[PDB]
Structure 1
Amino acid sequence: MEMKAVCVLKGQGPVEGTIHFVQKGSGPVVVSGTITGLTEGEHGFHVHQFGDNTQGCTSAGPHFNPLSKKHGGPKDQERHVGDLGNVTAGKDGVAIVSIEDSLIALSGDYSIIGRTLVVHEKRDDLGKGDNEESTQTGNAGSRLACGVIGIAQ
């Protein structure tokens, strides 16, 4: 039943974070954590495909997308498995991460264990933007920090 994971976000910039995941059986994945050093406002937050850090955050590849879907927010039927939407930083440069997601898992085909969590320079437009980029990355821009999602005690 009860699975736990951890991710240590690190980057070249001053963005740092610790994210925790817990899933009780078939229950949803509850994500809890903080990110620091952010500019005030919304920042895209996704699970990328590869847990590969040979090229900082570049080697993480694209949004985890085992179904061949277009980019969305967490609530839209049309979304990447990895689409966790946005986290909001305050004027202190800190976001509280508090997400409940049924599509991600810590086991089975949708498991995010050994994939890369990424927080982005800019707001994820949740795939509602006009241009092509919205259907792909939600125009969240740069990868500020990432880590491999690890199994936790």
Structure 2
Amino acid sequence: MEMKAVCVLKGQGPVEGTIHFVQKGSGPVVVSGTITGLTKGEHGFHVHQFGDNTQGCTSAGPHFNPLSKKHGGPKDQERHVGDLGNVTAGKDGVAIVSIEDSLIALSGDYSIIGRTLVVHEKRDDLGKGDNEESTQTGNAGSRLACGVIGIAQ
């Protein structure tokens, strides 16, 4: 039909945001919203496996990866389902999120409902880095803020 989701991001520092998700039937998922309190530049942005905030962002576990692939950018065939690339903040610390993705979903096997959205300290190298870390996390560094993706009206 039309599915909607929302995620409120919070962490140990000043990073916070609200992210919206809409999927018309089997179409792409449109991701939108704003994140504040970021350092100027690119920040890694992924859906992680577990909607578990019991030990902050660390209990979210790894990138959502039901097809057991290596980390990539959203545009790569080799990617985690959860790989949404980078969001960009300017001098004011504000990122405007605008992403269309056909691998994440708001129902079925690839559903991100009840999973965690995380925004990272550093840029996601999109799996192009020459180490194991790139093939797992895109060398995106620490988890600044996260939240559980919920069903929205």
Answer whether TM exceeds 0.5 for this pair: yes
CA distance, structure 2, for counterparts of residue 6 and residue 73 of structure 1: 22
Residue 52 (1) aligns with residue 52 (2): yes
Corresponding residue of 2:21: 21
Normalised to the residue count of structure 1, the TM-score between the two structures is: 0.99
3-state SS of 2:5 partner: strand
- The alpha carbon displacement at 1:75 in A equals 0.3
1:83-134 deviation per Cα after TM superposition (whole angstroms, max 9, x unaligned) = 0000001110000000000000000000000000000000000000011100
Query: Runs of 5+ in structure 1 lacking a partner?
Result: none
Identity rate, percent: 99
- The alpha carbon displacement at 1:33 in A equals 0.5
3-state SS of 2:55 partner: coil
Normalised to the residue count of structure 2, the TM-score between the two structures is: 0.99
1:20-57 deviation per Cα after TM superposition (whole angstroms, max 9, x unaligned) = 00000011000001000000000000000000011000
Q: CA RMSD in A?
A: 0.3
3-state SS of 1:55 partner: strand
Point out 4+ residue stretches in structure 1 off by more than 6 angstroms.
Answer: none
Corresponding residue of 1:143: 143
